[PDB]
């Protein structure tokens, strides 16, 4: 059981090294997760100065193993079943009429802490577009993730569309393609099709002088 490792509160560390149009940056994050209640509380900082993209565009990249799977759904929790060795999480995120992100992450236990270590590569962005121009509202519209098994990679796949509010009206689409594959060689729970539903709240810490984002999330799976 990898589920056992998530019975209480788990400390979380998130580390991202990024390059978007050659603009290098790093994000460091910390918080905790409670999969019994499906809750995450995290704070991220840009360790290199001003984040050169908007914070909301990184929410998806910055630990679906903390989803609350209800009792009748435990057998479909691929994420936890891969712990502690972890899983690799890869995405291409296409920003409509703009560039795309390519992310590759290891999600795994380092001793006591659940870690999410990410490499991100962004290309083909417009310098004065919504992303590199910072024209997105500091808020979030979540969207359901339809999890499918990817039996050839012994993991899962998903394709979901995120809508980012544009300053002064407008919606910027972020088309997410995702595949996960286990880091370990142990057996894994390959799920029937289901959804992950999450709700994200972005806020700020008044005392924090670095470019940062405070993130709270509720997350739950749901069958059929």
Characterization of the model:
This protein is an all-beta fold. The protein has a single domain (3-222), classed as Green fluorescent protein (Green Fluorescent Protein, Beta Barrel). It contains one helix and eleven strands. It has one helix spanning 78-81; strands spanning 9-20, 23-34, 39-46, 87-95, 100-110, 113-123, 145-150, 155-165, 171-182, 194-203, 212-222. It holds the Pfam family GFP. One of its GO terms (biological process) is bioluminescence.
Give the gist of this structure.
This protein is mainly β and 224 residues long.
Element layout with pairings:
Layout: E1 9-20, E2 23-34, E3 39-46, H1 78-81, E4 87-95, E5 100-110, E6 113-123, E7 145-150, E8 155-165, E9 171-182, E10 194-203, E11 212-222
Parallel strand pairs: 1-6
Antiparallel strand pairs: 1-2, 2-3, 3-11, 4-5, 4-9, 5-6, 7-8, 7-10, 8-9, 10-11
Q: What percent strand?
A: over 45%
Structural class: mainly beta
Largest sheet descriptor: 11 strands, mixed, barrel
> So how many helices?
1
Q: What is the strand tally?
A: 11
Q: Which architecture per CATH? A: Beta Barrel
InterPro entries: GFP (IPR009017), GFP-related (IPR011584), Green_fluorescent_prot (IPR000786)
Family: Belongs to the GFP family.
Protein name: Green fluorescent protein
Pfam families: GFP
